[PDB]
Motif scaffolding. Sequence first.
Motif, short mmCIF file in Angstrom:
data_model
loop_
_atom_site.label_atom_id
_atom_site.label_comp_id
_atom_site.label_asym_id
_atom_site.label_seq_id
_atom_site.Cartn_x
_atom_site.Cartn_y
_atom_site.Cartn_z
N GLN A 101 0.83 -1.19 0.00
CA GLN A 101 0.00 0.00 0.00
C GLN A 101 0.87 1.26 0.00
N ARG A 102 2.09 1.09 0.49
CA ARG A 102 3.03 2.19 0.55
C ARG A 102 2.91 3.07 -0.70
N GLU A 103 2.90 2.40 -1.85
CA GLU A 103 2.79 3.10 -3.12
C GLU A 103 1.32 3.30 -3.48
N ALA A 104 0.48 2.45 -2.92
CA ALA A 104 -0.95 2.52 -3.18
C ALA A 104 -1.52 3.77 -2.51
N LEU A 105 -0.78 4.27 -1.54
CA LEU A 105 -1.20 5.46 -0.81
C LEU A 105 -1.38 6.62 -1.80
N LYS A 106 -0.32 6.88 -2.55
CA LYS A 106 -0.34 7.95 -3.53
C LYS A 106 -1.60 7.82 -4.39
N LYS A 107 -1.95 6.58 -4.68
CA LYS A 107 -3.12 6.30 -5.49
C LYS A 107 -4.38 6.50 -4.64
N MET A 108 -4.25 6.19 -3.36
CA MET A 108 -5.37 6.34 -2.44
C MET A 108 -5.74 7.81 -2.26
N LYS A 109 -4.91 8.67 -2.82
CA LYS A 109 -5.15 10.10 -2.73
C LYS A 109 -5.98 10.56 -3.93
N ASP A 110 -5.46 10.27 -5.11
CA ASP A 110 -6.14 10.65 -6.34
C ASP A 110 -7.59 10.17 -6.27
N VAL A 111 -7.76 8.96 -5.76
CA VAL A 111 -9.08 8.38 -5.64
C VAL A 111 -10.01 9.38 -4.95
N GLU A 131 -9.03 12.74 -4.63
CA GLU A 131 -8.85 13.99 -5.35
C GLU A 131 -9.96 14.17 -6.39
N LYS A 132 -10.48 13.04 -6.85
CA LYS A 132 -11.54 13.07 -7.84
C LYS A 132 -12.82 12.50 -7.23
N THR A 133 -12.64 11.50 -6.38
CA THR A 133 -13.77 10.87 -5.72
C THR A 133 -13.51 10.76 -4.21
N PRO A 134 -13.52 11.94 -3.54
CA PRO A 134 -13.29 11.99 -2.11
C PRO A 134 -14.52 11.50 -1.34
N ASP A 156 -10.85 10.71 2.27
CA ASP A 156 -10.19 12.00 2.20
C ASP A 156 -8.68 11.78 2.13
N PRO A 157 -8.01 12.66 1.34
CA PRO A 157 -6.56 12.58 1.18
C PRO A 157 -5.85 13.10 2.43
N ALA A 158 -6.55 13.94 3.17
CA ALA A 158 -6.00 14.51 4.38
C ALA A 158 -5.83 13.42 5.44
N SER A 159 -6.46 12.28 5.16
CA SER A 159 -6.39 11.15 6.08
C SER A 159 -5.37 10.13 5.56
#
Length: 98
Positions: free
Chosen positions: A37-47, A49-52, A56-59
């Motif tokens: 997930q380490r790298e999936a995190l960055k992806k967990m943000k965009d998700v 960024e478009k579909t919050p 939330d990316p702040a989390s």
Amino acid sequence: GPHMTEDFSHLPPEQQRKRLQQQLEERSRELQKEVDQREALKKMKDVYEKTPQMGDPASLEPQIAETLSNIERLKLEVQKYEAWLAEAESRVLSNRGD
């Protein structure tokens, strides 16, 4: 076994190296779990960024630095162990009797 011991000193030099090993398989497991997930995190943000609406990316900020700061304290442990194996076995090897 039913119950588990505490210190692995009283244990033999043959089983002693059997401790780190296993414990290693874990120290690495919990690592590959955060790395997956380490790298999936960055992806967990965009998700978000478009579909919050799904998160939330702040989390993901306190989680990222966590997966980046953990992977360190994780692998590190996955090293000492992999190195302990020798630091332990050394006792066995040392004890010889050709």
